[PDB]
Design a protein around this nucleic acid. Sequence first.
DNA 1: CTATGACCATGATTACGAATTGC
DNA 2: TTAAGCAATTCGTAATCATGGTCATAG
Lengths: 1010, 306, 66
Amino acid sequence: RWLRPTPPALDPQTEPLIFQQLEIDHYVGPAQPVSVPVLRAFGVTDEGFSVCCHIHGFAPYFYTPAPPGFGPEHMGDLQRELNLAISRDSRGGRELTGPAVLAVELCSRESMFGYHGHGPSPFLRITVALPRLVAPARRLLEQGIRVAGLGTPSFAPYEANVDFEIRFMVDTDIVGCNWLELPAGKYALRLKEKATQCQLEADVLWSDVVSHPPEGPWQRIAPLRVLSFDIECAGRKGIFPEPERDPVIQICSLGLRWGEPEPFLRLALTLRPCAPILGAKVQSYEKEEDLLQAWSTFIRIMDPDVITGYNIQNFDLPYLISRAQTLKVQTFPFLGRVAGLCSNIRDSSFQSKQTGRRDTKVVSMVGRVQMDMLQVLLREYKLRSYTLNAVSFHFLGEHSIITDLQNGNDQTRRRLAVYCLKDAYLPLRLLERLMVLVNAVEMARVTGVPLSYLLSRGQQVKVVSQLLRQAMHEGLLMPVVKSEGGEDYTGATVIEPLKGYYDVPIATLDFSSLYPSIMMAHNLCYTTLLRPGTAQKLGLTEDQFIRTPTGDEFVKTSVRKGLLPQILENLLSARKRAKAELAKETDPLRRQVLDGRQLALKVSANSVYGFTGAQVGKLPCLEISQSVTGFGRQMIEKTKQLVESKYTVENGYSTSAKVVYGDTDSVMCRFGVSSVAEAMALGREAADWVSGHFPSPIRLEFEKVYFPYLLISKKRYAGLLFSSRPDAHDRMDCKGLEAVRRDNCPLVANLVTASLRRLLIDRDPEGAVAHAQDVISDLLCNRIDISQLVITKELTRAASDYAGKQAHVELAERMRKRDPGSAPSLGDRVPYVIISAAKGVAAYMKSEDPLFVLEHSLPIDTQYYLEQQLAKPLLRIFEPILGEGRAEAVLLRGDHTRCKTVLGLLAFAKRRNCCIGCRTVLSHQGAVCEFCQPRESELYQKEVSHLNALEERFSRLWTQCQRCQGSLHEDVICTSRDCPIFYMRKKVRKDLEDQEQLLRRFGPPGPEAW
Amino acid sequence: GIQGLAKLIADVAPSAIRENDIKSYFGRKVAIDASMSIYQFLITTSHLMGMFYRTIRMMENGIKPVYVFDGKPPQLKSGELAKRSETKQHNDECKHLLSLMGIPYLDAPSEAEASCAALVKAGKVYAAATEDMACLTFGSPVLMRHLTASEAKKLPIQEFHLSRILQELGLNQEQFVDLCILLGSDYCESIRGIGPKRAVDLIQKHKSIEEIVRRLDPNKYPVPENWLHKEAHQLFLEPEVLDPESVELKWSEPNEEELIKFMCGEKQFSEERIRSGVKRLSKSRQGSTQGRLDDFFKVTGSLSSA
Amino acid sequence: EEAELELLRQFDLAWQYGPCTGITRLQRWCRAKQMGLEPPPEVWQVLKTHPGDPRFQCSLWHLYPL
DNA sequence: CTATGACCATGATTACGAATTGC
DNA sequence: TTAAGCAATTCGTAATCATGGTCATAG
Ligand SMILES: Cc1cn([C@H]2C[C@H](O)[C@@H](COP(=O)(O)OP(=O)(O)OP(=O)(O)O)O2)c(=O)[nH]c1=O
Ligand code: SF4
Ligand SMILES: [Zn+2]
């Protein structure tokens, strides 16, 4: 629809180009100037034109040591290494490499690993023509033949085999989303006859570019173009949609320029004639071929930078591609920027111990960038459900019906289009509100990796990139060590608690950035690790090296500076600047998203240390990891000895303090005073006192005062939070307990939060007992919503769940009769509830889908929920304040309340009536019993105040759907399984149905036909 | 050894392979390949540490070991490959830790593995313990794998019965030899043509490569350069091995001092352990037990349900 | 039949007769006739040549827990 | 028609894997 | 060709081991 502005008057012999790049690309090419791999770079100007840039003359290489013989110091054998062996038996050694310009170069460099000296050594630099020839050469120089005139006897290892685009960016100092400049007279626009579809197309040599480091005025962001879209399909009853039978009926698109607070384009393309919508364009077609063609032409002409959505990768784009393949439309799958290239669906998997394992499809688009917001949420955030409704409530606050809204009239289709446009608008709001893209651009500028790697890869490519960028400045080469496999080492210490309930303030002192500052201030690195022999026979121990608790020796900083101290120092300053910016916000959600930014930079700095100990990886050095955790243990026991030893009764102070807890970075010391001001004063004195026994940047700091405190086990405690004194209290802290885990029911987590509220804030155990009694009583009397009963568990890799029978695996692998095409896959979460049956050996035989127990009305196992979900967390919490008469107190508060329980063949009812007063079954329909007839005015009085309260609950719920829907004049259709509103509006109809019929036992209060 | 062999069997005659527990081997005398063994431990006191512990574990379970060394190597493929271009120190350091533990040892005339088989097929020992399926090729009836694995790696030992392999593949030893060659012998280049499973079939209706070649002949399945498909087929048959009867192995009693005075001392290593070790070795002095019915009744055959 | 089942499905979604997914089909037909909006005399003449069948005398979504 | 222990049936203890959170 | 680490607590299922109620038959 709307086009980009027109590039007026660029003349290359006088004017430069200044543009900001988004994507890079590799390309094997003809039309050479009179190398074959030429590079592509796509970007945008400071105004809004689209620029493609072709870069020429770059070829991959690596290094290898020159062996000590008469060969690789003699030029005849250098060019003979270039020369091929013409023998017949060298077909395995000069064919797959063959005649390639590997070349011969002599340079003086060093290896990374260890500390041998300040002296370098000769290495050979071996270029290669193509990037897809470094793999057979590696298969032909190490295990292949290297008998060539006795120049290089096998073997010499390969060093610095890295990726092509990463080697380009390490070479020329270009980072992700960078400002690039072509100077005047260096670039030719009309040398390249147009093979792509951008406006400006330059054709430059790889030594002409100028990279501007992002800082000062070069810290801006260009006006990018962002698209979001959503589709609709018309299915059958029960049957989930399939790309060979179910047509695509509506596509809806939103588009904006980045930096402007509203969109500028709003389009909706439908398949029958429709009705107009104010604010958007509407076009209609009588066939699906025109609809797919129209969308492909719009996406070529608008030419967006970024494409977003929600689950567009695994649902939307391959559905469109398969549907275009079935209907024989040849011109659809050309969505990219290159004019002669069609797109294809390709599977990929990712797995780690940090995010688990996920299997995704990818679809190829060259030039353009994809950001599915579902994958960003699934990677960064740990939530309970990952539906669009659930995250839109958590962050903002909100198939067979559609097939008859489309086979109807045109106002129904207009309603369908407004629904689809709201769906297509929600991920834009989430992208701009959560500060996604600004943090992605800052991550790519601090680490130096492209913008597509932050959605596909892990935390290794970034630390490899930063280490290579720091390695070119002193002249070192990296080695290739690979081992399967070493052993584990010893991790962190935890101090033994003094368990219980405390009501005198405890002050928390901890170290900030512990492991990066250990690695900084004792000069630990790959490049300064001293081997056990190379100290000998030199004897200089003092101020030349140090010794660690695991046992290594490491050189002092008066000889070398390591590489990991400098990378860590850069990351630490970036996080410090993020916190300094975060210290001046007032909005809460903005404060937590800047907390998210600084959390991400601290995770990056700690993953630098975790790179060293990963024995399945790219470069492990477990000696360093052992030295780190040994220093950690030594320093925390130093802290505990010092804190408990100095402030004592004989040293003039009030009370000898005693440490109650410590977990590898923090110390919770109990001081003795019950005044929060005096505890805060002595705690600040203690933190600042103890910090002066270390190198720098090692510092201990005061952080909080808990008052009161509740310590249950290791990694399980709770307390109340004081930041200042006249800032009285902030909130609770629930470390580890049953309120922050997601393996349980909402009922149990709510009861634990409410019990700690009534028990820590108001200090009333009697209201707490009465609360827990009411929860158990309302459980047994069958008046608890089934939202509070849903359990969710993650469906991981299928073989560990083959090894032992679980409940959620049994529910998932059991398909439905309605739909063998929508079922949980690997990596998602399965929700279930437990119904009552008589198979007590197996709780995996009583699990059912919440919607299935909704539509089929199966009962609930209240004894399962009473003794297996609720009871034992309560016995954790309520015991330490009292004795074991407290277990008997809650099991007796159960006992007064356990005696109140509410209740094929089911069709053959008799429906025996019963007396309302004393429950005696009898013949006839009158409500009262003959012995209990006098007390009938009181028994009518009783239960009409129950009908009165059910009437008041019907009306508050069924008009809330009208305000959440938007309209007051049309029907509600919302079966949202993540809304408490749904199925709480279903049971009050039946309560009212039952309670209205019980009062017609009594006669009518008058006539009605008068 | 032979390439992709284990998988081939596993995939076409699993009845010849069993996953037994190290304990079930109590009372068995086994022939080991010291060379490979010594190597396994390395991949420098390891060449003996493992040569220590492991042999103790092999003893503790009733298994009576006999380490074997190689002599003058023969014409192995990659072996004499660098010759196309033109030590025993930590080795014998083991031939010592053994007799000092009362454990036999034999100097094979060439390839131990062949010698091991030589024994096994003479009743002089139960099975041969290596990691290379070669032994099977050499005619050995029983081959045990993993018997030298770390106490940690809870891997069970893998047994192989030649007479069961030959059974399924319906082919004599020799016929089996050719298969190993076309499967990937470490003596001569295989034939780029045939695949693992493919190589079997051919041999099945062509009791020799000599007949397999003359058949398939296009430039679509060419036969190797200097193919010694013959020389090899011979080695696997009549190798160079010390006569079985030539000697009688006798497990002696370990000499605590003389040895511990040549270990924890001369090679420095935690005394407390190598002491309790020599102690344990001295305890487990035996293995043979419970006889089989085979030992007294000839096997009639097999009754197969209708 | 199979043409009479689309006429009723077309009467059920025309907005000028009312917002009807809680009641029967003939009750909505008589409600519009009282107010006399314009009920057509064909959605009546198939609700008379049938007995109490639940796929003629019921709204489209008379399943569906809404 | 009546003692005795052998036999079936039901409940208490231990072991280990899976899931998830704290540093 | 691809993947940052370790410590600790909780719960469910199958298997191991203890103990009583019938019963079956020798006295
Ligand atoms: C959270 C976390 C901690 N650690 C280690 C490194 C840390 O130095 C040590 C302390 O944990 P943390 O206190 O969580 O982190 P931190 O001390 O480094 O930073 P800050 O005080 O500002 O919050 O625990 C990891 O190795 N990986 C991790 O993911
Ligand atoms: S049931 Fe009602 S309140 Fe709940 S989400 Fe649906 S429309 Fe909104
Ligand atoms: Zn009564």
